[PDB]
């Protein structure tokens, strides 16, 4: 039962760490702080007006 619980836990933690690493990889590959409206929308809109 708790065997299940702890393995699942490990799974939760590892997945969260990977998700962080993957967002890091996003900005890593693109070389951009931002590319999406759901990153930080206000920066996007200010980008359009500044453009």
């Amino acid at each position: 039962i708790s065997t299940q619980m702890m393995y699942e836990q490990n799974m939760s933690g590892i997945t969260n760490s990977q998700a962080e690493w993957m967002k890091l990889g996003e900005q890593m590959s693109t070389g951009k702080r931002v590319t999406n409206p759901s990153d930080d929308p206000i920066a996007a809109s200010q980008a359009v007006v500044l453009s």
């Binding site: 393995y7 799974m11 962080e20 900005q27 070389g31 951009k32 702080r33 980008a47």
Partner: protein, 52 residues
């Protein structure tokens, strides 16, 4: 000159400092590896609970 100023303005909104993200993903990769170990260890051990 007015174009230059706005060009400099643009980057701060959208560009990324490189050192921060690099060091970041390096350290998170190490942590990721360690937790990976821990999964493998814990399940192999859980196998002894019954490897008997």
């Amino acid at each position: 000159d007015r174009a230059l100023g706005q060009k400099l303005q643009m980057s701060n909104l959208v560009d990324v400092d490189w050192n921060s993200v690099i060091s970041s993903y390096v350290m998170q990769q190490a942590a990721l590896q360690a937790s990976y170990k821990t999964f493998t260890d814990m399940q192999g051990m859980s196998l002894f609970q019954l490897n008997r």
